[PDB]
Amino acid sequence: NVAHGLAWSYYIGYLRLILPELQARIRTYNQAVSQRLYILLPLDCGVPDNLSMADPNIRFLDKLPQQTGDRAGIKDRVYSNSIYELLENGQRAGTCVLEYATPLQTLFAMSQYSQAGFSREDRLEQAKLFCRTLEDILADAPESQNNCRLIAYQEPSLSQEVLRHLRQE
Amino acid sequence: NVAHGLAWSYYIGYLRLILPELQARIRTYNQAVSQRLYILLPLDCGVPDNLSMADPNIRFLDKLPQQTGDRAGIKDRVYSNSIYELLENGQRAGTCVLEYATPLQTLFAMSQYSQAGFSREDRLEQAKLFCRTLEDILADAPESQNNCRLIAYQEPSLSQEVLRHLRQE
Numbered sequence: 441n442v443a444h445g446l447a448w449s450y451y452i453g454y455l456r457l458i459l460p461e462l463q464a465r466i467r468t469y470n471q472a473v474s475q476r477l478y479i480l481l482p483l484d485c486g487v488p489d490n491l492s493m494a495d496p497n498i499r500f501l502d503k504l505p506q507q508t509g510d511r512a513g514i515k516d517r518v519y520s521n522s523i524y525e526l527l528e529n530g531q532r533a534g535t536c537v538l539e540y541a542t543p544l545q546t547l548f549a550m551s552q553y554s555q556a557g558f559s560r561e562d563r564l565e566q567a568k569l570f571c572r573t574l575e576d577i578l579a580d581a582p583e584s585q586n587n588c589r590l591i592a593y594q595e596p597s598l599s600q601e602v603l604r605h606l607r608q609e
Numbered sequence: 610n611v612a613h614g615l616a617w618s619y620y621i622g623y624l625r626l627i628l629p630e631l632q633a634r635i636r637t638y639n640q641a642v643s644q645r646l647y648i649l650l651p652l653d654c655g656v657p658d659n660l661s662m663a664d665p666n667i668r669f670l671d672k673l674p675q676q677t678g679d680r681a682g683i684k685d686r687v688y689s690n691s692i693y694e695l696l697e698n699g700q701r702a703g704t705c706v707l708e709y710a711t712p713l714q715t716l717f718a719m720s721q722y723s724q725a726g727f728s729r730e731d732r733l734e735q736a737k738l739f740c741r742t743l744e745d746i747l748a749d750a751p752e753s754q755n756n757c758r759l760i761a762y763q764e765p766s767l768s769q770e771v772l773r774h775l776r777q778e
C-alpha cells in the first residue's frame with residue numbers, strides 16, 4: 441500500500457500549499473482560464489512529461505505566475521503550473537490549468553526497480569488506491585473549495601475526457 | 610511502512626533527476642562551494658522551513674542556477690537549491706549546498722491528520738526506516754557518485770554536525 445503514503449504526500453507537499461493560492465494566481469493571469477486545477481490520473485500509470493504529445497488537441501498556452509516559498513531549507517522553492525488549450529474539431533473548446541498526478545510516475549518507476557519490491561502487475565491496484573485515497577482527502581480538505589477536479593480514466597481521446605469535466609463546470 | 614514509499618519517491622522524483630546535473634551547476638556557480646548535496650535527516654521529523662533559524666551559524670549565501678525540465682505535463686518545472694555558509698566561532702568554516710529531506714515533513718503532517726491513520730508515536734520508527742531505505746538506494750544508485758551525503762541525527766549544534774561531515778571530505 442505504497443499509494444496511501446504517496447497520496448498523502450501529494451496532498452501535504454503540493455495541494456494544500458498551492459490550492460489556497462490558486463484562484464489569485466488565475467485571476468492575475470486573466471487580468472479566460474478556468475478556476476480549477478485539473479489533475480489527470482491515468483490508472484495505467486502512464487504519465488508522459490509532455491502533455492502535447494499525449495493528445496495533439498491538448499496545446500500548451502502559457503504558465504501561471506510562479507508561487508514561491510521557503511520549504512525545508514530551500515529558499516524560494518518554485519511551484520509552477522501550465523495552462524493548456526483544449527481543441528475540438530479545430531476549435532478552442534476550453535482553457536484550464538492541466539497536469540498529471542506526478543506520484544503515478546513513482547508507482548511506475550518502483551515497479552521497474554528490483555530493489556523497490558513492487559510487482560509490475562500491481563500498478564493498476566495501487567493507482568486505484570492512490571485515486572481513492574486522494575478523493576477521500578480532497579472531499580474533506582478545507583484547502584479544496586471548488587479548487588480542483590480529479591480526472592481518473594482507464595484507456596482500453598484524452599482531450600475529450602478533460603472537456604467532459606470542463607462542461608459540467 | 611509509509612516511509613518506504615516516501616524514500617523511493619524522494620529518489621525517483623528528486624535525487625535521480627538533480628544529482629547527475631549537480632556537479633555542472635556547482636561548477637557554473639564557482640566560476641568555493643563543495644561538490645556534494647548535503648541532506649539533513651532529523652529523526653524527530655522536525656523540519657524547519659528556514660535553515661537560518663534552526664542554527665544561527667547556518668547562514669544562507671546564494672542559490673545555484675536553476676534546473677528546469679518538463680515533468681508530468683508541467684512545462685519547465687523548477688528544481689532549485691540553496692547554498693549555505695557554516696560558521697564556527699565567528700569564522701566561515703565551510704560552504705555547501707544544504708537542505709532538509711522534505712518527506713520527513715510528510716511523516717510529521719500525517720501523524721497530525723486523523724484521517725491518515727498514522728500514530729504520533731511512530732514518527733521516530735518511520736524516520737529511521739526512511740533513512741535506512743534511502744541509504745540502501747543511494748549506495749547502489751548510479752546517479753550518486755560522491756554526489757550527496759546523508760546527515761542523520763537524533764537531537765537529545767546542527768552546524769557542528771554538518772561541519773563534521775564536511776571535514777571528512
Ligand SMILES: Nc1ncnc2c1ncn2[C@@H]1C[C@@H]2COP(=O)(O)O[C@H]3[C@@H](F)[C@H](n4cnc5c(N)ncnc54)O[C@@H]3COP(=O)(O)O[C@H]2[C@H]1F
Nearest residue numbers: 449450453454518519542543618619622623687688711712
Ligand atoms: N523542486 C524540488 N525541490 C525540492 N525537493 C523536491 C523538488 N522536486 C521534488 N522534490 C522532492 C522529491 C519528493 C517527491 O517528488 P514527486 O515525486 O515529484 O512528488 C511531488 C509532486 F507530485 C507534488 N509536488 C510538490 N511540489 C511540486 C511542484 N513544485 N510542482 C509539481 N508538483 C509538485 O507533490 C509531491 C510531494 O512533494 P514533496 O515536496 O512532499 O516531496 C518531494 C520532495 F521531497
